Structure 1
Amino acid sequence: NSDSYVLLSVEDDGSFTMIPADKVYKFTARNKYATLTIDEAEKRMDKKSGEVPRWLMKHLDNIGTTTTRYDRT
């Protein structure tokens, strides 16, 4: 409903400005926790195990592969 919305801000002098809003964007945080990757993900989700390892991501992090973007920086 980006069309039906319309903006009204009080300014410093008390001016009430009149903006017809055009579009809305929704933002989600991403890779805050060192996400895994596609190929080893496929070997994980393939039906080779009765259950995948419970602490598999923690074990991969202890091995050191697939660090966070903040860690790479």
Structure 2
Amino acid sequence: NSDSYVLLSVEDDGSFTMIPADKVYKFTARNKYATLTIDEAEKRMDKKSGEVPRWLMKHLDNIGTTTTRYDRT
């Protein structure tokens, strides 16, 4: 819907400048929670286990592999 929108932003005096919008972008958080690796992900996806462990991510985090960006910083 990036065409039809128009902006009513109040100014300090109360002025309403018309800024015709051009595009709209959507942002999500990412790697907030120590994301995993595609390779070992494929090995979990394959039928090596009939069901993968429920706390397997907790065990990997206790191992310390692929930690958070904040923890690495």
Q: Structures share a fold, TM > 0.5? A: yes
Moved over 4 A (4+): none
Uncovered stretches (5+) of structure 1, i.e. residues with no partner: none
SS in 2 for 1:58: helix
CA distance in 2, matches of 1:64, 1:9: 48
Please tell me the root mean square deviation across aligned C-alpha atoms, in Å: 0.6
SS in 1 for 2:21: coil
Tell me the CA shift for residue 48 of structure 1: 1.3
Identity %: 100
CA distance in 2, matches of 1:64, 1:71: 10
TM norm structure 1: 0.97
Number of matched pairs: 73
Q: Cα deviation per residue 1:14-62 (whole Å; 9 max; x = unaligned)?
A: 1111000000000000011000010000101101111001100000010
The residue correspondences of 1:15-30 to structure 2 (distance < 5 A) are 15-30=15-30
CA distance in 2, matches of 1:10, 1:28: 28
